[PDB]
Design a protein around this ligand. Structure first.
Ligand SMILES: CC(=O)SCCNC(=O)CCNC(=O)[C@H](O)C(C)(C)COP(=O)(O)OP(=O)(O)OC[C@H]1O[C@@H](n2cnc3c(N)ncnc32)[C@H](O)[C@@H]1OP(=O)(O)O
Ligand SMILES: CC(=O)SCCNC(=O)CCNC(=O)[C@H](O)C(C)(C)COP(=O)(O)OP(=O)(O)OC[C@H]1O[C@@H](n2cnc3c(N)ncnc32)[C@H](O)[C@@H]1OP(=O)(O)O
Ligand SMILES: CC(=O)SCCNC(=O)CCNC(=O)[C@H](O)C(C)(C)COP(=O)(O)OP(=O)(O)OC[C@H]1O[C@@H](n2cnc3c(N)ncnc32)[C@H](O)[C@@H]1OP(=O)(O)O
Ligand SMILES: CC(=O)SCCNC(=O)CCNC(=O)[C@H](O)C(C)(C)COP(=O)(O)OP(=O)(O)OC[C@H]1O[C@@H](n2cnc3c(N)ncnc32)[C@H](O)[C@@H]1OP(=O)(O)O
Ligand SMILES: [Cl-]
Lengths: 313, 316
């Protein structure tokens, strides 16, 4: 059994699907999009029996800026790790994770996270992967709070509907105002996302803006089967059926919160998706305390993910 | 707004599907199967605006024996409660649960449970219904541990048979094994599983849905398996609308206490799955498992799919 670098994305995707594809169905397009475009220092280590892939870990160090933020080099990530089911409990996972942790630690990482990376597949350890929590815990990762992907069917329910506030799809002329808003209200990871996604296929039609007069005060990113950029809400579209969609992120300026404007933006974003003939759709990577906000629109927790962090000693 | 008894199963199914049908797709065949054949003292109270159902609660008291066991009349169950999305936060849920609880308390109930009933739809509060936990908490229910439904695709993996001791062999049930099945169950699982065997055989369960393990001639264990031909719809295949073409399921599975911890369960499981895999089964579910038993099933590539939280209110 050899441990060595690999970039055979087809072999990886095949193994992923054989092992967890029922719940995290992976296509090669998504895998490539996410891996090739990520700007962090990144590596894939594979476990091999001769030329046959029997497991892999993907891992990253935070070395690229996030909007107005400079990289914190102390932070590393396990994007994913999977050993094939017929090769479990032989030490391969341990060897893979050791290789990745050693490399990260040698490069200055002091805090290791399970998912939550740029171009993540996972916000945290999936509930479907709950048995792996024992493997991580033994290896010094602390199990923290939960995040949730929510699911709803916008075709299924009708909802009932403020001076100077308007919500419309983005037009190309809005670009400048969108970026000023982000620089001001969401200047980290959501800003970085907007910058990078526009360089790899996101259209203005996927963005809804709420304005007060001329000024942008919040946004959503929405998804359907015509979107070219494949974002987290539609990662798992194989489970969502036909005319699938998604929504996230969504944010309002802190100054304008708690007066129903989030609710208006959400309502109008959904109506737009509804008129695009969307049915089943996902809202990604929510905290518990915000579920009810989307739940008023009949969204329910679908998938859960457990945050998990190892402090290097 | 009016609260009254209802048996309009169609309107209930529609309301269910409108509100939670993306993750718990209900149909009338399943609903009727589980509601009508339940033998407990049972009721549905509906909430209505004029003629229109806007909410319901289904609830039960343990009044019917469970195999060798007498009922414990102190246990009541909330089988399900759903208020329509367009009428939430108006106190309808409170009203319905108040009436359900009051009736149950007056018949001698001291322990109220969220799901887990006979002919349940849920083992506990679904994780998809997590925001309800807070609703139940306000009422004095206490949140305990979790159960899981597991999922796998038995078409995608091959396993080496586990190495088997002489005298043991595993076979689909035949119609004469019946006598010795019930002797095994009376001896080894004489509550809920015995009872369900009794009842399920009367409403379409078939020998082909049962696998049995034997030491020479004696029945030492069983599994219940399911596919698109099963006419009894049990827990593993409740949500078969989410499982695609050629769905299946497995559960319960049990080994006589004296034969445990020697690999016999693993053999029973392996062969039960082999049978399924030969029947062209693809995605399948294993229902209502505890955390300590997930990895027994996980060896065969099963993964937790749905989670339910145990929740109990003590009447004071
Ligand atoms: C951020 C994320 O990626 S979250 C998603 C996590 N991934 C998954 O859940 C996918 C499914 N699971 C898996 O792929 C695997 O179960 C993994 C990756 C979690 C673990 O890989 P494995 O190769 O089984 O790990 P490994 O065999 O090193 O360790 C498992 C146990 O077997 C033990 N072991 C090692 N060698 C042997 C042996 N020869 N015989 C028996 N046991 C052994 C290890 O000591 C370990 O026990 P411990 O945890 O008590 O120390
Ligand atoms: C899918 C996701 O984006 S989950 C994360 C949601 N967004 C955030 O947490 C960003 C910060 N918070 C906010 O922008 C706002 O509080 C929102 C959008 C969640 C709610 O907006 P409000 O205007 O406060 O909503 P209101 O309740 O008054 O209607
Ligand atoms: C065992 C099982 O069935 S588990 C599955 C449970 N069901 C579900 O999850 C299905 C989806 N959810 C629902 O159908 C609903 O949200 C339910 C059934 C959980 C709650 O129903 P509702 O009718 O909205 O509840 P109800 O209005 O009585 O009270 C809830 C809240 O409404 C508000 N409220 C209560 N009464 C009033 C009133 N008269 N006017 C305005 N607001 C009110 C309170 O904020 C209360 O808060 P709390 O939840 O902290 O107590
Ligand atoms: C889906 C479900 O039926 S979950 C509940 C599993 N069944 C039970 O818990 C019944 C009691 N336990 C048993 O019968 C057995 O211990 C089993 C079947 C779980 C395991 O059997 P064992 O013979 O210990 O398996 P093994 O020795 O192969 O490991
Ligand atoms: Cl941000």
């Amino acid at each position: 059994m050899e441990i060595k670098e690999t970039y055979d994305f087809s072999s990886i995707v095949d193994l992923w699907n054989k092992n967890i594809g029922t719940v995290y169905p992976m296509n090669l397009e998504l895998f490539k999009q996410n891996y090739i475009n990520d700007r962090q220092r990144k590596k894939i280590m594979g476990a091999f029996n001769g030329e046959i892939l029997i497991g892999f870990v993907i891992y990253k160090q935070w070395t690229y800026k996030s909007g107005s933020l400079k990289p914190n080099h102390k932070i590393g990530y396990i994007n994913s790790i999977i050993v094939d089911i017929n090769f479990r409990h032989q030490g391969i996972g341990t060897k893979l994770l050791d290789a990745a942790e050693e490399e990260l630690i040698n490069s200055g990482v002091k805090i290791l996270r399970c998912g939550s990376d740029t171009y993540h597949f996972f916000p945290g350890i999936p509930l479907e992967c709950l048995p792996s929590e024992e493997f991580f815990l033994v290896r010094g990762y602390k199990m923290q709070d939960y995040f949730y992907d929510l699911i709803g069917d916008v075709s299924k329910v009708d909802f009932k509907k403020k001076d100077g506030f308007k919500v419309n799809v983005m037009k190309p002329e809005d670009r400048k105002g969108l970026f000023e808003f982000l620089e001001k209200s969401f200047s980290g990871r959501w800003l970085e996302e907007f910058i990078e996604f526009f360089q790899v296929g996101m259209k203005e039609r996927d963005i809804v803006l709420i304005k007060y007069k001329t000024s942008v005060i919040g946004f959503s990113h929405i998804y359907d089967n015509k979107s070219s950029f494949i974002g987290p809400p539609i990662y798992w579209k194989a489970l969502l059926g036909h005319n699938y969609g998604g929504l996230g992120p969504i944010g309002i300026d802190k100054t304008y919160r708690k007066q129903g404007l989030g609710r208006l933006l959400l309502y109008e974003s959904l109506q737009i998706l509804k008129k695009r003939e969307v049915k089943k759709m996902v809202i990604d990577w929510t905290e518990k305390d915000i579920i009810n906000f989307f739940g008023r629109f009949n969204f329910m927790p679908w998938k859960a993910y457990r945050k998990a962090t190892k402090e290097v000693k």
